[model samples]
Target: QQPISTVATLIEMYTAGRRDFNRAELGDANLQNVDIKGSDLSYADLSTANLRGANLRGTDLSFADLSQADLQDADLRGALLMSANLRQANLQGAKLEKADCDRNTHFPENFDLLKAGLQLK
Candidate 1:
């Protein structure tokens, strides 16, 4: 797992066809409105990160810790989120259609996983 220094680094790397970002260290980073869809972020540490208005469609986020992160309006359709920790994360108006999650997945408190249209694995 490599430590992603900044949002600009990730943007530059993603532009260079480097999508394999599994186990990345991006805790508390501000990733607002960035487009890195279809990348692999499984097992990444994203706790307290600001992901508002970001595009994460089809990204692999299984087992990633996203506790207390701000994810308002983030697009997560078709993303794999099995066993991902999302405790207390803000997901207001976020799109989760067809995203994959399982019993081990910790969603936001009082959030309705069924209505969100997640594909439980």
Candidate 2:
């Protein structure tokens, strides 16, 4: 079992943009609005985490597990999302404009332009 204190530290470190928590076990943690640009988050477990409105532009999320996560209005433009598992994630009202998405990339069956109100460059 992971320590509660470790979770706290993970939050703190992540808030500070520390790479220490990049490979930490923070499953199901509330990490909303965190900026994780250009970090190595490959293969990290982030299931059920609340990443709403977070800045993940240019972040490396290849093969990361993101099942059931809330990523509403999150900025993932130009992000590396190849091979990432986003199964069952809520992307409603989320913006993926200018973000790279391959055939294997997971996304909603339909993306509403209104949901993506404001676009990124």
Candidate 3:
């Protein structure tokens, strides 16, 4: 997450020969495939966000509200998810390699991220 003026600013930059916001705010926003690697996204409010292909490797997501967010095929390597709310969030095919989470990780009842393509370690 590079320091930019705002999401809109980043978007403007993305349109003008700049790098794409791979970890852009697709959660309820138009942006998708946002790359938030090694970013400080703790407590981000991404409810109902569209993170279908976001790259979230090494991100700080502690206590973040991610209810009902679509995270299909999103990378989650080395991500900190302490007490994060994942109620009804679709983590299908989302990579969980080296991701930190509590024993009571909430799911949609018998949800298997591995079956969905998550490579947990």
Candidate 4:
């Protein structure tokens, strides 16, 4: 099992420009209003994590489990979201401009990606 303490390691590495965080386990972590821009979070388990107002621009989130995560007002511009699970996640006021999502990307019920300016791959 990957350590949950990787969040601190991530912050340290990100401070040094090392942004690769593929398949990491960060479920239920508190990361509200954090700036994690340009990081690679593919296949990571961020379920129920508090990411409100976090900066996720240009991040790779493909196949990640973000179910029930708090993403209100988060910046997700240019993020890759193929097959990512966002079921029941809160995205109120979040920016999705140019965020790329494939057919397999899961979202909350009645959520409109078209209105959010996301382009399907």
Candidate 5:
């Protein structure tokens, strides 16, 4: 079981030069419009988090569990999403330009990631 962390605490830690949030439980966190670019969030459990309008460009999210997360209009350009679980996540209007993914990347059924401009590697 992972401990739940508040967004404020996360930002604080990130500002303190601690960006590795791997396997951290941030479920249902409200981080709307926050800028967290270049953060390392690999393998993090961010299910159901509210990340609308957040800037996550160049972030590492490989193998992360983002199921049901609210990512509407968020910026995810050039992010790594290999094998990440995005099942049932809200990605409407989200910018995934140049993001990296593979066959192992799990997305919502019929989500059309390729059409969404995600790069398949």
Candidate 6:
């Protein structure tokens, strides 16, 4: 399949009042401190992306790839993470309150999901 400019278009569309971005290719994107609360990002590819301080509250992140992503201080409250790949993703100072994560969700080594407030789905 031909690659689309998903990252740039996503930011632009979000700026234009669009929110649904399911299956977006956001790999390696620099999204530090961006506010994308309540957006739909299910099945999106965000691997190795910089998500420091990003507002991800109430977003649908099921099956999203967040491997090796920089998520320091990111807000993920009430987000759906069922089957999401968060391995090696930094969560220092990040909020995971009420985030829904199924057993199929892949987490980093020794990650304390309960302590982080991730609810089992």
Who is ahead in TM-score, 5 or 6? 6
Question: What's the distance in Å from true for residue 81, model 3?
Answer: 0.6
* lDDT at residue 59 of model 3 (Cα atoms): 77
Q: Model 4 over residues 3-95: C-alpha lDDT tens digits? A: 334678878878888778888788878888888899889998999888999999999999989988999999999999899999889999999
Q: What C-alpha lDDT values do all the predictions have?
A: 0.90, 0.65, 0.66, 0.89, 0.87, 0.89
Ten contiguous residues minimizing lDDT sum, candidate 5: 1-10
Give the number of colliding residue pairs in candidate 6.
Answer: 0
* lDDT tens per residue, model 1, 4-59: 65778888899999888888788888999988999999998899899999999999
- Where does model 3 exceed 4 Å of error? 1-6, 9-27, 103-105, 113-121
- How many clashes does the backbone of model 5 have? 0
Model 2, stretches more than 4 Å misplaced? 1-7, 11-17, 20-23, 111-121
Best by TM-score: 1
Clashing pairs in 1: none
Please write out the lDDT profile of model 5 over residues 1-121, one tens digit for every residue: 3432778788887788876777767887888998888988898888889999999999999998898899999999999999998988889999998999999888888788768899987
Find the 10 residues in a row with the least total lDDT in model 2: 112-121
* 1-121 per-residue lDDT for model 6 (tens digits): 3332456777778788877888888898898999888888998889989999999999999999998899999999999999999999999999998999998999999888879988989
Ranking by TM-score: 1, 4, 6, 5, 2, 3
Query: Model 5 off-target regions past 4 Å?
Result: 1-4
lDDT of 5 at 88: 88
Model 3 TM-score? 0.69
Q: Give the per-residue lDDT digits (tens) of candidate 2, residues 11-119.
A: 5665676653344455687778877666666667777778898887777666767777888888877676666678788886566666654556555456553354423
